[PDB]
Amino acid sequence: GSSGSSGCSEEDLKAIQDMFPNMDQEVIRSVLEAQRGNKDAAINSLLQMGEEPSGPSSG
C-alpha cells in the first residue's frame, strides 16, 4: 500500500514543490521523472543537486 500509484504523479510532485518552491518546476519534474517517479528519490536527488546554504540545522 502506498508505493507507486502509476509512475510520475502530480501529487507527489506538488509535494516536492512545497518543500522546494525556490527550485524550478521543470527541474523538480525532471528529477521525479528521472527518478522512476520516486518523490523520495527525487527529494534526495534535489537535496543533493545544487548547493544549499550551510549553517545550523535543527528542524
UniProtKB/Swiss-Prot annotation:
It is found in: Cytoplasm; Endosome; Early endosome. Residues 8-51 form the CUE domain. Transmembrane segments: none annotated. Phosphorylated by IRAK1 upon stimulation by IL-1 or microbial products. Disulfide bonds: none annotated. Belongs to the tollip family. Component of the signaling pathway of IL-1 and Toll-like receptors. Inhibits cell activation by microbial products. Recruits IRAK1 to the IL-1 receptor complex. Inhibits IRAK1 phosphorylation and kinase activity. Connects the ubiquitin pathway to autophagy by functioning as a ubiquitin-ATG8 family adapter and thus mediating autophagic clearance of ubiquitin conjugates. The TOLLIP-dependent selective autophagy pathway plays an important role in clearance of cytotoxic polyQ proteins aggregates. In a complex with TOM1, recruits ubiquitin-conjugated proteins onto early endosomes. Both ATG8-interaction motifs (AIM1 and AIM2) are required for the association with ATG8 family proteins. The N-terminal TOM1-binding domain (residues 1-53) is a disordered domain that partially folds when bound to the GAT domain of TOM1. Oligomerizes. Interacts (via C-terminus) with TLR2 and the TLR4-MD2 complex. Exists as complex with IRAK1 in unstimulated cells. Upon IL-1 signaling, binds to the activated IL-1 receptor complex containing IL-1RI, IL-1RacP and the adapter protein MyD88, where it interacts with the TIR domain of IL-1RacP. MyD88 then triggers IRAK1 autophosphorylation, which in turn leads to the dissociation of IRAK1 from TOLLIP and IL-1RAcP. This is Toll-interacting protein. The lineage of its organism: Eukaryota, Metazoa, Chordata, Craniata, Vertebrata. The gene is TOLLIP. The chain holds residues 229 to 274 of 274 of the full protein.
